Paper text:
Based on the overall more similar kinetics with Glc and Gal, we expected the V546C mutant to behave structurally more similar to H167A (and the wild type) than does the H450G variant. The differences between the wild-type mimic H167A and V546C when binding 3FGlc are very subtle. Upon replacement, the second branching methyl group in Val546 is eliminated, allowing the introduced cysteine to relax the 546 backbone, which in turn allows the Cβ atom of residue 546 to move slightly closer to the sugar. Thus, for the competing 2- and 3-oxidation binding modes of Glc, the V546C mutant is indeed structurally almost identical to TmP2O H167A and the wild type (unpublished results).
In this context, Trametes multicolor pyranose 2-oxidase (TmP2O; EC 1.1.3.10; for a review, see) is of interest since it can oxidize both β-D-Glc and β-D-Gal to the corresponding 2-keto sugars, which are intermediates for production of D-fructose and D-tagatose. TmP2O is a homotetrameric enzyme produced by lignocellulolytic fungi and has been assigned a role in lignin degradation. The reaction catalyzed by TmP2O is of the ping-pong type involving a reductive and an oxidative half-reaction. Therefore, to evaluate and compare the productive and competing sugar-binding modes for oxidation of Glc and Gal, we used crystal-structure analysis of 2- and 3-fluorinated Glc and Gal derivatives bound to the TmP2O variants H167A, V546C, H450G and H450G/V546C.
Numbering used by the authors:
A (entry chain A), B (entry chain A): 46 to 618
C (entry chain A): 92 to 181
D (entry chain A): 454 to 543
């Protein structure tokens, strides 16, 4: 018997943990995955010395914990088998594929991650605010009070994630790029560092934030927290919430302990679901919310008819560029060079303080030292120079989010022929209109690896503004990127597979009125009709957004938690 | 001040830990890597529910922690850059490549793993004994006493690893294959399960063994062990052992704490190095054993002239096959089938106990149930059937080790068009004659990611018996594999890149006499001349072997540890 | 039999490929899901580009091809001309 | 007729091709037929195959053939990477 139970240990779950453990509640949290981030439970897997010294390898850790949501049945022809080998007569259901899934109306890139800390054990840590145009309303008919509420919430989210905008300020590459783009767009667009949930520990090490940063996930009571109560149970699949006959309250949570194989029930006062945009919906549909099976509009759902409808996922465009000869030469423009590399007459100098210098002294010293210490290297950038982390945030005249950076998730055979110091990544994310016909649904016959109803998408990028925007977005990346360098062969401009970006929203969407706004939770993230059930995460977001959604989702959880502290009393100690 | 210090936390290091912590010694162990296997320190990363339910993804975790040893300078021509992009005039030293390395005399597949538990946090767990022909002598001129010593040591190694040969006995696929190969080679070759360091917990879960299984790596004293003393220090790069002027004793170990960045010295009575075949040699060469820089036979080394010479790595050949129509039909040969799948008249039956049945009742029940429950599936093998784990061990008439199995390390884009139940992997490993000219050496100018001397190989498979064997090995795989099925397109018979198999040996080799046997350690694994320095691991193995070397290496550590308990007194408590 | 092809014999593969027209190409079912949202996108794997909807892809001779030029296939062939022994011969 | 991206890294003087051709039992069920609805480029009835290598001797032979090429070829050299032993498309 707990005061609160939380399903999932990602950063939205940990947000509830932090708020409620902190306010004196007896909390239990379950995760279907296991502890595997070392002694800091749920921490970023990229915070090892070895991965910050071999950062290209980290793509392998990401790929290792992205399990695809719905893989259609495979119809590739293999006709060079030996005549003796067993050969198919048909393309029958093979290797865990989903026969419900139409391959042509899928989010084939969508994937889930099942480990303690969720996806925040691998993510890129970008945490921008949404402006009004991308954000759901929290106050009706009062634009300025809506702004102040969002500002209050986001400011708190940013402290929980340790969001900052200056961790890369001493990078030559970062500033090379930033300054050129500010110059080029002078006035018309503003560039800044990507706000990043991260703290720099040294010039070659960044402590990336995660679920652990929000809440350390250590069981309580303990010496550091002797009057808090928290227990995390890993390797427990949560399968169903039990409704009372009134559909006004949840009475238990049904679970499957994966180690013993036993099934149990858990009672609490408050039930919170933060299993992710896909798995929140799966658990609700298994519990008799929404509708199970292929959509059938001839059978109105009894509860939450909007559940699994109006889903959104962003369009993503990508390339890499190789830095221009112009930009590279500009790095060393305050240097006087005499002699020729490798003689002992060779001299690279600058005047410290010189009003005519284009760069600050610190920049010139790095360049001087690199050039003198490494006289066989043909580039003026130091080898340990941190990577760029540049953005122009979404605006009405350019309604996409942009990252001009170095992401650990490479999409191709990472290449070796071009010096890494020259390479810049470009990712532009578009916003997607919510439409009722775009759906995530669950099979009433096919089941997944955990014997739960198999997830199935029915999705196309909407015609009209979504599609026009996505193609204007592609053109913008082409135009903007040419300012910095030409494309890197094998990383040419392209749309990524649908759902690869993992920003899926609106699967359990938020609004003021269940009917009128076609929604599932209210602005306290409470499920309509039910006193003690709440949903957290990106699934709540009802709007068309291009920016990275997690900080937003956290803000909404903070507000949800105020509702809980004002409406439920913690058990005595 | 410790009684014993151990460099590295892989399973050979943990062998010393187990023996010496157990015998009452005050032990400290350092690793340059960090704890990241969840709450069981140094355990197999494949022991999560999620990875045993998505086993194809585990290749990504392996690739994520294999960092290449020596990558030659890249000379690929990229001539489709934009004219504006910075373009090279030469193939200069880029992206951490090693200019000392000849690309044509490399072990390009060789890689190291830096995490607590070492490579045993990802390995395949195959642990066969070497027969006489592959094994170094531990007793001179007495074949039968040599056998009994090896038998005593191996039996102890097998308990520490929990080696077994029946964990797969209930697999239809495993037995399908095993029985056909026994029949086909009747008499001339014997097949058995690959001995595996592993314990089955259920029909769909195997608890794979690791460094953790040898020694749990928990600091001591603790409640379970109140009179033992052990401390593990992760993220500490060990750089040098300090010799006394007599070169008869080590006086300290110099270390670099990677978190603070500070450098310290550690004193102990006994020094043990188990940093792996490559990193043991690197640490010794940094300490003035052997010779630093490109080999120069005009400057005889002062200590251990054989260090880094006579290295061996095995040749590896690979394919996959698709199971024959014949073999698949044989799975269901005791079944009477009436009706046609999917009608309600459909019936699949057998007689339990029938003397005329080719299979045991348990086999027939699985097949019956699968066929009746899954009437849309065209194969008689159940979906959760465990994978084959078959071997014919090395013999003089077939001097290669063989694995006929399913390995988590796939080498190609894992494919989806052919049902996984039909696929069998074939890996044949050859033995390599030790030659003085085959070397691992360290640069006196280039340094690696940890500012240590850059490793550089000079290696070719020896002409003569090694090469003839490797090509007869390839032919054997071709011949033997056809008995089970034809090759899977995209997995055709091939030699793998040199060193991919990660069985490198002889970099610090064992013998009776330093001069006479061209060696570095004696049969107690003690370094010649030095009272208190020992080396563990595959680097000790002086012979040409085809079988997986780790169990052997453990056996040698067990013997080393007897020497220590008989020659050094633990500090009082 | 040109001087230029006997001096650059690797290029002759291109002349062979240039006159082998496939006999029966089943309907294509490859998924292309990285089209721009603005581009025309199929709802089904309909009959495209001269493919044959009668053809089962799994019971084909997909490599079979014909050559339509004066001299037929003997304008590109390898010229191997062995006798059949009794066991192969009508 | 090379089947792959002709390669340049290994001297052509070292390279030898191996092609082993098997015999196929005639079976009534293996057919070439023509569509009464689909037509080809010359408005003639579209050719359509219904073919599998026969079970029994044909298939056993084809796999013993593959093994023979493997065994025989090793006498001359090892396989060239990117030209490894394979069945060609039917
Ligand atoms: C993978 C990835 C993800 C993101 C980025 C890049 C990469 C490669 N980058 C990124 C993202 N978001 C941003 O805003 N900024 C960035 O730069 N990524 C997305 C981000 O990582 C997610 O939006 C965020 O985690 C969502 O948090 P959450 O709502 O707490 O959900 P999680 O998926 O992280 O964790 C949920 C959780 O629940 C479990 N689970 C699932 N089913 C169950 C059941 N049935 N019972 C119990 N537990 C369950 C999981 O195992 C998991 O831990
Ligand atoms: C990666 C891999 C390895 C093996 C198999 C498959 C795969 C994909 N399969 C396998 C193997 N061996 C077998 O006999 N059977 C199998 O089926 N693999 C090899 C096996 O995994 C190794 O032979 C074994 O670990 C060797 O053990 P070890 O001698 O204890 O060495 P490790 O590499 O495991 O650990 C050494 C260790 O030392 C560290 N390190 C390195 N440098 C330093 C310095 N300078 N200071 C401190 N520590 C250092 C590492 O970080 C590491 O933990
Ligand atoms: O695909 C990688 C991208 O994935 C997204 O999930 C992130 O929000 C981006 F920051 C990131 O670059
Ligand atoms: O490359 C994978 C192989 O690596 C080797 O290190 C192992 O000993 C084999 F068992 C394994 O199949």
């Amino acid at each position: 018997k707990y005061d609160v139970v939380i399903v999932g240990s990602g950063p939205i779950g940990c947000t509830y943990a932090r708020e409620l453990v902190g306010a004196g509640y007896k909390v239990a949290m379950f995760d279907i995955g296991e502890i595997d981030s070392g002694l800091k439970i749920g921490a970023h897997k990229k915070n090892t010395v070895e991965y910050q010294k071999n950062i290209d390898k980290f793509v392998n850790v990401i790929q290792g914990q992205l399990m695809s949501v719905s893989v259609p049945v495979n119809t590739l022809v293999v006709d060079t088998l030996s005549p003796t080998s067993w050969q198919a007569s048909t393309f029958f259901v093979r290797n865990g594929s989903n026969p419900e899934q139409d391959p042509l109306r899928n989010l084939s890139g969508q994937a889930v991650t099942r480990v303690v800390g969720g996806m925040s054990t691998h993510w890129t840590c970008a945490t921008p605010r949404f402006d009004r145009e991308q954000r759901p309303l929290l106050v009706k008919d009062d634009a300025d009070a809506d702004d102040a509420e969002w500002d209050r919430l986001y400011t708190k989210a940013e402290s929980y994630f340790q969001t900052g905008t200056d961790q890369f300020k001493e990078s030559i590459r970062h500033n090379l790029v930033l300054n050129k783009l500010t110059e080029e767009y002078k006035g018309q667009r503003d560039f800044q560092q990507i706000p990043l949930a991260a703290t720099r520990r040294s010039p070659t090490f960044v402590e990336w934030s995660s679920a652990n940063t929000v809440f350390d996930l250590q069981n309580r009571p303990n010496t550091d927290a002797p009057e808090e109560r928290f227990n995390l149970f890993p390797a427990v699949a949560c399968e169903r919430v039990v409704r009372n006959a009134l559909n006004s309250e949840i009475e238990s949570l049904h679970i499957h302990d994966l180690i013993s194989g036993d099934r149990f029930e858990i009672k609490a006062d408050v039930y919170v679901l933060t299993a992710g945009a896909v798995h929140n919906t799966q658990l609700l549909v298994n519990s008799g919310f929404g509708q199970l099976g292929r959509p059938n509009p001839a059978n109105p759902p009894e509860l939450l008819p909007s559940l699994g409808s109006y889903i959104t996922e962003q369009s993503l465009v990508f390339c890499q560029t190789v830095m221009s000869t112009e930009l590279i030469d500009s790095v060393k423009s305050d240097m006087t060079i005499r002699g020729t590399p490798g003689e002992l007459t060779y001299s690279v100098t600058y005047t410290p303080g010189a009003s005519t210098n284009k760069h600050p002294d610190w920049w010139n010293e790095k360049v001087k030292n690199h050039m003198m210490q490494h006289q066989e290297d043909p580039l003026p950038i130091p080898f340990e120079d941190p990577e760029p982390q540049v953005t122009t945030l979404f605006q009405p005249s350019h309604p996409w989010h942009t990252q001009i950076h170095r992401d650990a998730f490479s999409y191709g055979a990472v290449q070796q022929s071009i010096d890494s110091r020259l390479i810049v990544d470009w990712r532009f994310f578009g916003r997607t209109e919510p439409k009722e016909e775009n759906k995530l649904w669950f099979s009433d016959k096919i089941t997944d690896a955990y014997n739960m109803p198999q997830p199935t998408f029915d999705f196309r990028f909407p015609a009209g503004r979504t599609s026009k925007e996505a193609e204007d977005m592609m053109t913008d990346m082409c135009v903007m990127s040419a300012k910095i360098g030409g494309f890197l062969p094998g990383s040419l401009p392209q749309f990524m597979e649908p759902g690869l970006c993992l920003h899926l929203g609106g699967t359990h969407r938020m609004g003021f009125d269940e009917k009128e706004d076609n929604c599932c939770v209210n602005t306290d993230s409470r499920v309509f009709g039910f006193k003690n059930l709440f949903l957290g995460g990106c699934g709540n977001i009802p709007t068309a957004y291009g920016a990275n959604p997690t900080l937003t989702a956290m803000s909404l959880a903070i507000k949800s938690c105020e509702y809980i502290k004002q409406n439920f009393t913690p058990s005595p100690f």
